[PDB]
Amino acid sequence: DPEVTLLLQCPGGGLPQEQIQAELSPAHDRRPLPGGDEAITAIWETRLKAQPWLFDAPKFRLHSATLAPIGSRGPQLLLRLGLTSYRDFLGTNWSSSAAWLRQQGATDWGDTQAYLADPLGVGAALATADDFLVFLRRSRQVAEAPGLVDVPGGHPEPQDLAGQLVVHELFSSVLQEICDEVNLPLLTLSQPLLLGIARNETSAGRASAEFYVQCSLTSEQVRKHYLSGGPEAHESTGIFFVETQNVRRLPETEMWAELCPSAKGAIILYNRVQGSPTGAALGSPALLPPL
Ligand SMILES: Fc1ccc(Cn2cnc3ccccc32)cc1
């Protein structure tokens, strides 16, 4: 799977909010482009002269993520974050010359991402009470991965001492994205666990944090809630469910070619961190069938 790379796999079956630190610093921002940020401003002006209803928004930038030694006490992960924007994204990661910016970043900074906006996305492996994961079908009319299968998620917007408020907004945002798109009540959702971080090599390496969330509703109840919003309550065009039993071998199915890279990241991390049992009982042949 060349279009996705794992940056982080979390230990302990995934990390709760209380075990993560963020460091928000202008040191973690994109570097100004070799020939000036005028190239970004020109792309944005061109785009507004065709679609004058578009608006900019701030985004978190992922710089790096350091895991503590496994089995230790205290905070288990440090996220190094800066600030970027939708405009900077459209001028760098989504530019036709994005590969040239990666090579120049390696040359100038020893960092393929130094000239890239790299806005941090969030996604969820969302499990139902009857042991299915939730999938969404993307519109065929959007710019990114048209007509492909996705999981719930988005790109959260800004507003350990500013750090703890940023970690809170990351965890809050994946629940809010589930409520907005799947039309579920907030009280049917567990506190998320961070599974890891995956990069989309089709979008010049921009990263998404992938989370596990459990819902107290069955697949049939989740479908009812999604459909009862009507066509205007969701950006997706359909919902469907796969038994967690069958998610284990999803990369061997015909579904795998229809999954967008960030959803592939969510499913690989779910299989490595929530699946793949380590103990004698769940590891026994009848419960973990060989091959
Ligand atoms: F920081 C962000 C990163 C991606 C999106 C998703 N999105 C929205 N409009 C897009 C146009 C081209 C490609 C992707 C796009 C939003 C914010």
Note the resolution in Å, 1 decimal. 1.7
Domain of 269, in residue numbers = 1-277
CA distance 206 to 204: 6
- State phi, psi for 82 to the nearest 5 degrees: -125, -160
Peptide-bond breaks in the chain following residues (C–N over 2.5 A): 159
Is 284 among the domain residues?
no
CA-to-CA distance for 20 and 200, rounded, in angstroms?
Answer: 23
* Count: domains in the chain: 1
- Paired sense of beta strands 132-137 and 238-243, if any: antiparallel
Atom of ligand 1 nearest to the CA of 85: 1
26 found inside a domain: yes
Experimental method: X-ray
Beta bridge partners of 122: 154, 209
Q: How many whole angstroms separate alpha carbon 107 and alpha carbon 101?
A: 10
Ligand 1 environment, Cβ below 6 A: 59, 86, 89, 94, 119, 143-144, 155
Query: Does 151 map to a domain?
Result: yes
Structure tokens at 227: 């459909």
The number of the ligand 1 atom at minimal distance from the alpha carbon of 59 is 1
β partners of residue 81: 24, 62
Residue 153 counted as domain residue? yes
Looking at the domain assignment, is residue 240 inside a domain?
A: yes
Residue 290 lies in a domain: no
Q: Does residue 286 form part of some domain?
A: no
What is the spatial distance between Cα 247 and Cα 198, in angstroms, rounded to a whole number? 18
Phi, psi of 157 (to 5 degrees): -110, 125
Phi first, then psi: give them for residue 121, nearest 5 degrees: -90, 160
N-to-C CA span, the chain: 20
- The annotation places the binding site for Mg(2+) at 177, 181
Q: Does residue 282 lie within any of the structural domains?
A: no
Nearest CA to ligand 1 atom 11: 143
Q: Which two tokens stand for residue 224?
A: 């009812």
User: From atom 9 of ligand 1, which residue's Cα is the shortest distance away?
Assistant: 143
CA–centroid distance, residue 194 to ligand 1 (Å): 23
Q: Decide: 208 and 123 in contact? Cβ < 8 Å.
A: yes
Binding site members for substrate: 55, 86, 138, 143, 150, 155, 157, 262
Using CA atoms, how far apart are residues 15 and 170, in angstroms rounded to an integer?
A: 13
Q: 86: CA distance to ligand 1 center in Å?
A: 7
